[PDB]
A and B are shown apart, each in its own frame.
Chain A
Amino acid sequence: EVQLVESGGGLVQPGGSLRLSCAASGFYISYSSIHWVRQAPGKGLEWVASISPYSGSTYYADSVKGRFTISADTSKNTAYLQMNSLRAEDTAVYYCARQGYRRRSGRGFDYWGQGTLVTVSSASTKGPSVFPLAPSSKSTSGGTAALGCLVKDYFPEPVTVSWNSGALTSGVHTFPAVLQSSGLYSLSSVVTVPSSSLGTQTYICNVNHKPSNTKVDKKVEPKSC
């Protein structure tokens, strides 16, 4: 029943602007306080802003005060976060949350949206180069061989990786991306497989980066001697 869907996220230059929306369903926002909380990647929850019912009073974290404006359109049952003068450090997943009913759950935020990613950067959208991580012309570490794909120099997040169109899932590890000093991301996905099948079993990494219309499949093979 109760649900919240944020939208509007995406990539924006520093000093730019972006409006997020938070579509409620299953309840009417007019009877609730609505909040925005954000999470920089790898970090914790940071409270951003809120709007109180009946008075329309609004409150803001110091770190965003003056730049961000929260608001509500009851007729669309939607709330908004107008972000202006954006800085790289506003890069975060943005969640809207409902503060629940006082008698039922005090001031706890009983429902949260799935979140929308806001990337603030002067880097421009770019698809990855995808390189093989070829299995060693040796034998073993553990008893098995390791191979993979290096997904290098894309922007912004995110990218998806799978192996053999989803059929190969066991022994897979897709690493969280690092932000390189160039301002581009890079990650690798690896899989351990038996070394006896390296010449006869086929291994393809499937990489999708939607923001740049880049979808690639890379066969990973042993090369020479």
Chain B
Amino acid sequence: SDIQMTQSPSSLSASVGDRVTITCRASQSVSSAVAWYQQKPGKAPKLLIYSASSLYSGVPSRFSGSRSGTDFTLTISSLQPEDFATYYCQQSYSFPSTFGQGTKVEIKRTVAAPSVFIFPPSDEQLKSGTASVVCLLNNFYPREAKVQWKVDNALQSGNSQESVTEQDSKDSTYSLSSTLTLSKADYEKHKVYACEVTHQGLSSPVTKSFNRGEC
């Protein structure tokens, strides 16, 4: 049996100054051969804790690790701005080695509603037989948001893709683009293109739309 490291939670929101705890639970005894790592977007992981509870040289002491049987915890006693990142536990008691799923630690702030924008496809793109319609949800929090596409008031499904930005380094919000992809023929068979947004900072759903072949 390969050893499982079950990591929870997969994400958490916290304010600067808060005490947070992240947990890895081993499927069998791993002694104390557990390490903890920090990873920021686009960057290699950095070692924080080794042997379950030893602080790695140069790591600030607000980081601590603890072992309770086969359960392991990384605690940060008081988060600082630079501590927002993803954390991974690792067992190296035996091979194969196992990493935990990770825990994204994100910063908490006041609910912010998104600003919504819709973009019709360019005539340029239209020359090639594909129409891309784009909807932008700008600078909102929390991350949960619902985007729905309507074409002549018919609800679209399976023909869109979303993408979300990393939480912003200044205002701590998210942005989201959703893209509806149609063949040029389908696109030209309809008039009203709409993007409907549902977010916590919105009292009611907001719809941004345009009519094909207008302004």
Q: Which residues of A contact B (CB under 8 A)?
A: 35, 37, 44-47, 50, 59-62, 95, 99-100, 104-110, 112-115, 129, 131-134, 136-137, 141-142, 144, 146, 148, 150, 152, 173-178, 180, 186-188, 190, 192, 224-225
Q: Do B163 and A47 touch (CB < 8 A)?
A: no
Residue among B46, B49, B54, B136 with the highest chain A CB neighbour number at 10 A = B136
Partner of A190, one of B44, B96, B136: B136
Residues of B contacting A: mostly: strand
Among A137, A177, A188, A225, the most chain B Cβ lie within 10 Å of the Cβ of A188
Q: Can you report 27 residue pairs joining A to B where beta carbons are below 8 Å apart?
A: A44-B99, A44-B100, A45-B37, A45-B88, A45-B90, A47-B90, A62-B2, A105-B56, A106-B33, A106-B51, A109-B47, A110-B47, A129-B128, A131-B125, A132-B122, A133-B119, A136-B118, A136-B210, A146-B115, A146-B136, A146-B138, A148-B136, A174-B165, A180-B161, A188-B179, A190-B136, A192-B115
Q: Give the CA-CA distance A104 to B159 in the complex, in Å.
A: 53
Contact call B47/A224, Cβ cutoff below 8 A: no
Complex: chain A residue closest to B116, CB-CB: A141
Q: Which residues in chain B, 16-56, are within 8 Å of chain A measured between CB atoms?
A: 32-33, 35, 37, 39, 43-47, 49-51, 54, 56
Q: Are B122 and A45 in contact (CB under 8 A)?
A: no
Are the CB atoms of A134 and B119 closer together than 8 Å? yes
Chain A residues with Cβ below 8 Å from B37 are 45, 109
Mark out the residues of chain B between 164 and 215 whose CB falls within 8 Å of any chain A CB in the assembled complex.
164-165, 175, 177, 179, 181, 208, 210, 214-215
- What separation, in Å, do the CA atoms of A133 and B178 have in the docked complex? 13
- State how many residues of chain B have any CB contact under 8 Å with chain A: 55
The answer for the CA separation of A208 and B136 in the assembled complex, in Å, is 23
The answer to whether B215 and A225 have CB atoms under 8 Å apart is yes
Residue of B nearest to A105 (CB): B50
The answer to whether A137 and B122 touch (CB under 8 A), given A44-B101, A45-B45, A107-B50, is: no
User: When the two chains form the complex, which single residue of B33, B99, B121, B179 contacts A46, counting CB atoms closer than 8 Å?
Assistant: B99
Contacts of A190 in B (CB 8 A): 117, 136, 138, 175, 177
0/1 string, B39-79, CB within 8 A of A gives 1: 10001111101110010110000000000000000000000
Q: Is the CB of A59 within 8 A of B47?
A: no
Would A114 and B99 be within 8 Å (CB), given that A108-B56, A142-B115 are in contact? no
**Is the C-beta of B102 less than 8 angstroms from some C-beta in chain A?**
yes
Binding site for A on B (CB under 8 A): 2, 32-33, 35, 37, 39, 43-47, 49-51, 54, 56-57, 88, 90, 92, 95-102, 115-119, 121-122, 124-125, 128, 132, 134, 136, 138, 161-165, 175, 177, 179, 181, 208, 210, 214-215
**Residue numbers in A under 8 Å from B214 (CB-CB):** 225
Contact of B177 among A105, A113, A175, A224 (CB under 8 A): A175
Given A44-B101, A133-B134, A150-B134, A176 contacting B33 (CB threshold 8 A): no
Contact between B47 and A108 (Cβ–Cβ < 8 Å)? yes
A146-B115, A188-B134 known; A50-B97 Cβ under 8 A: yes
Give bound CA distance, A175 to B162, whole Å.
9
| Cβ contact within 8 Å between A47 and B165 | no
Q: Please measure, in the bound complex, the distance between the C-alpha atom of A60 and the C-alpha atom of B215, giving whole angstroms.
A: 60
> Nearest residue in A to B46 (C-beta to C-beta)?
A112
Q: Which 5 A-B pairs have the closest CB atoms?
A: A108-B50, A112-B44, A106-B51, A142-B115, A108-B35
- Nearest-neighbor residue (CB-CB) of A174 within chain B: B165
In the complex, the answer to whether B33 meets A107 with C-beta atoms within 8 Å is yes
